[PDB]
């Protein structure tokens, strides 16, 4: 219902969206464009990394999980710098920067 109506943005529907990708997909189907019970890409993209930074998404020591969160929200610079710090994934982060360049 609230995937069709883009409502109840605060309720993460955790009963059915238990994975991270299920959350991203749940919200990107809820973002809106031009006051209550409404979320926009700017709020969502900022809300995610500002409040729930790397710390929240890298506790499982899985780096790509956070990268996908930033890249699939149009925050390409964040995801590039972030992934560029993983000494094992420097190569990959430089190139995804070149492509964007």
């Amino acid at each position: 219902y609230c995937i069709i109506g883009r409502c109840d943005v605060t309720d993460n529907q955790s009963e059915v969206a238990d994975k991270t990708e299920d959350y991203l997909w749940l919200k990107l189907n809820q973002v809106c464009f031009d006051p209550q019970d409404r979320l926009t890409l700017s709020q969502f993209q900022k809300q995610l990394l500002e409040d729930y930074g790397e710390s929240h998404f890298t506790v499982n020591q899985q780096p790509f999980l956070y990268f996908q969160v930033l890249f699939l929200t149009a925050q390409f610079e964040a995801a590039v710098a972030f992934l560029f710090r993983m000494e094992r994934l420097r190569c990959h982060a430089v190139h995804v920067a070149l492509v964007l360049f």
Binding site: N12, S14, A17, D18, K19, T20, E21, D22, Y23, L48, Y52, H56, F57, V59, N60, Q62, F64, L65
Partner: peptide, 8 residues
Amino acid sequence: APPVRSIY
């Protein structure tokens, strides 16, 4: 309260 469990 988003989960941190990656789709595996």
